Design a protein around this ligand. Structure first.
Ligand SMILES: OC[C@H]1O[C@@H](O)[C@@H](O)[C@@H](O)[C@@H]1O
Ligand SMILES: OC[C@H]1O[C@@H](O)[C@@H](O)[C@@H](O)[C@@H]1O
Ligand SMILES: OC[C@H]1O[C@@H](O)[C@@H](O)[C@@H](O)[C@@H]1O
Ligand SMILES: OC[C@H]1O[C@H](O)[C@@H](O)[C@@H](O)[C@@H]1O
Lengths: 344, 346
């Protein structure tokens, strides 16, 4: 078998006190510790998840009644270990996926379905040849329709913005405040609706001290916000999502605990205390959260990431509860392996 | 600060029972979880370590009284996250480093220094265009001088061999026995001297069951050996090294425990029970062991790898003891970060 810390739970079928003996899955055609991006339709009708296969291609898992896997970027196009982040607007007929080339330049993939078209193509951002820190992660928001903002870590470790819209093409945007940890995970959200202008932007990142911090764009420029987590694991995955609840933006910020369990902080008329959503240890690797507002007014959340041993999980918050059923989305060949909990 | 499990020690200066509050170093120009290859000279005089920088270049740390860092392969030559493995013979003037291209093909870097030469150049393996499983690790041995063997994981997850020597050029070699875990770490050693022929080859890997297993080559062919570890962490780093102690090959096999401490098992007139070499948790990432035999017949070991938070460590076994001082080798810009031991999620 493989050994796992006895005090930690490897799956939803682990013993209550930790792992004793169980079977878990290794999906070996998923890049180990793959990046993830995601977007659920604002109606909840379908879901998009993007990930990196073992061969370095970028693939898509689309849920529409069932999950269907496809390839969106051929092998050779993306850095092995690229970050990923996605945009969806129109309300839901225009998709952009951002990633890094093997030369650490911002790249863009475009998928347009307006009027029943199906165009998939390289975006104009590639022309700017924006070289980023090689360990940079990526975030992005959209507003007013096709006004786009891409966030990354520049070569001096500051967070940086690139902008698109208003007929200007891609241009360098703001340099953001704060002192970001080199290689920090980053996640940016727009608290206002996709077609509204101005946006209300928040970004989440880890600082050089290990704390988690918040970027705010609200009225007159970028500032550091009130969200402060004094201590978090080194290079902890971070992903945030926002959707309105009772006509007010509900931000969910997720990161990993020292046990690699998922911690959630909610902003909705103030920040609520961080809370562990479940006690199952995921692989310490990128996660991706998305959300929508049901027609009954409640906010659903989905989180994607890597579960033991190497599988794409889906965690579901629906009707006010995290479902005990944690799904797994197969992306290729798999082997089952026995796992035993071992003490120090 | 950053949070670290309170029950684990992050460094030599951690409290006796785990981490309380301390400062540790983030070397952010070392690729996080870099691969490592290494070779100490058979005389013990100097050391070579290879690693991947954050920008994807392959760099070299050379010790000869002091550590000196140089760049051997520019960005673009190697896959981001490439495995690495090295050969040294001549007895000690001919170096090879194996890595993967960004298209998952075997590549070879050569460094020849015989007769005072100083030549770095691409090897002929590149032209063979050998596609491997994208998560393949790499091992290699040399014998009879320049008879070379490169070990990798093929697309069907079997371990595979490529051969060089006898004027034949690079050719496909054996398919090895056993059922390897996809992406397993691998480490191959030659128990016989660099100029001897035949070799006595051992390889260490993780199987589909999670156990650790051993490849054996002797005259007659390949077989699965008697070294068996029934359970190990999933995708545990593995590195082995061999050198003669009192004229008999002493194999040291290293892997990580669930606490990410280094476990050692020695073969020398039989296998000895696995034993933790120290209780400091390294980053769960590639390690690299090397060894040499002193004039008195005793065997020194060096282990390289990633220590918290992201630093290149050197652990030293010298004159029969692991030295308490665990060294760090700076490879670029660094920031110190406070680390606090935490017992629960919140
Ligand atoms: O129509 C294609 C264009 O769409 C815009 O929204 C941006 O994504 C451009 O970079 C892209 O070239
Ligand atoms: O002389 C150069 C040659 O050296 C041999 O040992 C091998 O490494 C070859 O691949 C290389 O081309
Ligand atoms: O002769 C075969 C045996 O040789 C010894 O050196 C060890 O490596 C054993 O594990 C192996 O099975
Ligand atoms: O207006 C800025 C303010 O907006 C929201 O309330 C949250 O994102 C806060 O953390 C932030 O300080």
């Amino acid at each position: 078998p493989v050994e796992f810390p006895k005090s930690l739970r490897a799956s939803s079928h682990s013993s209550e006190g930790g792992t004793t003996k169980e079977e878990d899955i290794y999906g070996y055609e998923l890049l180990y510790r793959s990046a993830f991006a995601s977007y659920i339709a604002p109606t909840g009708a379908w879901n998009l998840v993007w990930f990196q296969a073992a061969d370095g291609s970028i693939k898509q898992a689309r849920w529409y009644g069932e999950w269907v896997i496809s390839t969106v970027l051929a092998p050779g196009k993306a850095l092995q270990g690229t970050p990923l982040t996605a945009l969806l607007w129109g309300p839901q007929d225009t998709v952009r996926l951002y990633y890094l080339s093997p030369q650490f330049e911002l790249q863009e993939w475009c998928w347009d379905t307006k009027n029943g078209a199906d165009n998939k193509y390289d975006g104009a951002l590639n022309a700017a040849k924006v070289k980023v820190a090689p360990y940079s992660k990526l975030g992005a928001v959209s507003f007013g329709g096709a006004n786009l903002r891409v966030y990354y870590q520049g070569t001096n470790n500051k967070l940086e913005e690139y902008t698109f819209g208003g007929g200007q093409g891609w241009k360098k945007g703001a340099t953001l405040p704060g002192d970001p940890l080199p290689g920090t995970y980053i996640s940016f959200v727009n608290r206002n609706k996709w077609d509204a202008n101005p946006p209300s932007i928040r970004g989440y990142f880890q600082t050089v001290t290990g704390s988690l911090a918040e970027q705010v764009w609200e009225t007159g420029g970028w500032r550091i916000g009130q969200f402060v987590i004094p201590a978090a694991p080194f290079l902890t995955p971070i992903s945030a999502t926002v959707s309105p609840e009772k006509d007010f933006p509900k931000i969910h910020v997720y990161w990993l605990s020292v046990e690699s369990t998922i911690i959630e902080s909610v902003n909705w008329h103030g920040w609520k205390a961080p809370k562990q959503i479940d006690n199952i240890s995921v692989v310490k690797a990128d996660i991706s959260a998305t959300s929508f507002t049901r027609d009954d007014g409640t906010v659903d959340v989905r989180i994607y990431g890597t579960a033991q041993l190497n599988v794409l999980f889906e965690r579901i918050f629906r009707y006010g509860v995290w479902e005990e059923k944690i799904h797994s989305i197969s992306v290729g060949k798999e082997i089952p392996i026995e796992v035993v909990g071992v003490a120090a």
